[PDB]
Amino acid sequence: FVEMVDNLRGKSGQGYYVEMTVGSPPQTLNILVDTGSSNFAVGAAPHPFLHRYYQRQLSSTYRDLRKGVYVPYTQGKWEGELGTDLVSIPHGPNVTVRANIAAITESDKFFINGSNWEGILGLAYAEIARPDDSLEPFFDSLVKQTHVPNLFSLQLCGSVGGSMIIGGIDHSLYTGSLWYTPIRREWYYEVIIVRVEINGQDLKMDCKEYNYDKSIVDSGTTNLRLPKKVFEAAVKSIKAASSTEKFPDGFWLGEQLVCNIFPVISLYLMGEVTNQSFRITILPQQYLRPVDCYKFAISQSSTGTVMGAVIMEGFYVVFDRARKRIGFAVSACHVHDEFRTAAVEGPFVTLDMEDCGYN
Numbered sequence: 117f118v119e120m121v122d123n124l125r126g127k128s129g130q131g132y133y134v135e136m137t138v139g140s141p142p143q144t145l146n147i148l149v150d151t152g153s154s155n156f157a158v159g160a161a162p163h164p165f166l167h168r169y170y171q172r173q174l175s176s177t178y179r180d181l182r183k184g185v186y187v188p189y190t191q192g193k194w195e196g197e198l199g200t201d202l203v204s205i206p207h208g209p210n211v212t213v214r215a216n217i218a219a220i221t222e223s224d225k226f227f228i229n230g231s232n233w234e235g236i237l238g239l240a241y242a243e244i245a246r247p248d249d250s251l252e253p254f255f256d257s258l259v260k261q262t263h264v265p266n267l268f269s270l271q272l273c274g275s276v277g278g279s280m281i282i283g284g285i286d287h288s289l290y291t292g293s294l295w296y297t298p299i300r301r302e303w304y305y306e307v308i309i310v311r312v313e314i315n316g317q318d319l320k321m322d323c324k325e326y327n328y329d330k331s332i333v334d335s336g337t338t339n340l341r342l343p344k345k346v347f348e349a350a351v352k353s354i355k356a357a358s359s360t361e362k363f364p365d366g367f368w369l370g371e372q373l374v375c376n377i378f379p380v381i382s383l384y385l386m387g388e389v390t391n392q393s394f395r396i397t398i399l400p401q402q403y404l405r406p407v408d409c410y411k412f413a414i415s416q417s418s419t420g421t422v423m424g425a426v427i428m429e430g431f432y433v434v435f436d437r438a439r440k441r442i443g444f445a446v447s448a449c450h451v452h453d454e455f456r457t458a459a460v461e462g463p464f465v466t467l468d469m470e471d472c473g474y475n
């Protein structure tokens with residue numbers, strides 16, 4: 117997996133991308149790595165923001181599915197034509213698979229002006245694939261067609277770099293032990309948070325609130341998104357812990373920027389065993405992101421908890437699809453100081469962990 121190390125690139129707040137080839141002869145494209153969606157979709161028209169795009173006319177192995185797909189977001193939209201072609205990852209496993217590809221023909225607020233990627237690789241499950249679950253996601257196709265193990269891992273380092281290890285784990289990318297949390301349901305990478313601590317102090321909330329209406333691991337989101345009831349209780353604790361300096365209310369809501377005082381955030385995740393949990397701890401260096409001007413990278417959510425780049429950059433994260441579990445370990449590349457470091461600790465005794473999940 118040595119060749120897969122350092123295969124991710126990107127710009128701060130614009131996501132992480134991997135190099136991929138599509139078609140015959142191979143057309144090179146940079147593709148956003150997204151564990152929060154399930155579609156493989158690439159720019160296929162000369163949009164002004166794009167360095168390059170998928171040209172189906174040049175591909176002898178392209179097959180038309182004669183179906184369209186419309187994907188609206190809360191903050192964006194893309195529309196495309198469905199098809200299949202041969203897909204390879206140059207700095208991944210030495211294999212070529214026939215995968216579903218949505219040729220993006222129309223979009224709004226999807227591509228980023230100034231970014232170096234022109235497509236999205238949805239690494240989540242078929243349940244949330246569009247138009248429906250019959251459209252097989254890329255990784256499902258990869259595992260079925262080859263001998264690549266049903267597992268991938270991500271090391272996102274805080275312009276930016278990282279590693280996507282496809283089909284395995286690179287032990288040099290983390291320190292200590294991996295700790296696993298069960299994937300509750302195979303749609304998003306859904307997990308269960310059982311306890312939240314700010315500087316070691318428990319928020320004293322019903323743990324069902326932490327997962328309302330879900331908690332997910334998402335490489336395609338920058339921020340740590342929390343449910344509003346959890347967010348206001350979390351922010352109130354951060355305000356009290358950072359009472360040394362005063363900050364405007366707009367800063368905490370992400371409406372304005374600010375130019376040891378900040379507390380650590382610990383998330384206890386459901387363990388592999390009954391009544392067993394473990395905790396992951398992040399630093400200010402993770403949730404206070406440079407834009408010196410800093411943006412408070414914790415926001416309220418209506419879709420539930422989203423463990424975005426804020427969480428993931430502190431850890432080496434293993435998406436063990438084969439065993440329906442997600443592993444966390446201290447990242448060997450995470451940003452810290454001499455006083456505090458990111459941590460993965462366990463085991464802990466936590467009762468009624470099944471009550472924390474929303475139904």
Ligand SMILES: Cc1noc(C)c1[C@@H]1C[C@@H](c2cc(-c3cncnc3)c(F)cc2F)N[C@@H](N)S1
Nearest residue numbers: 129130131150152153189190191226334336337
């Ligand atoms: C769901 C959803 N509802 O509203 C939004 C904004 C989404 C995202 C959809 C998708 C997505 C992310 C980014 C991005 C941006 N900045 C950094 N990283 C990724 C992008 F540019 C285009 C995208 F299509 N990935 C997701 N996980 S969240």
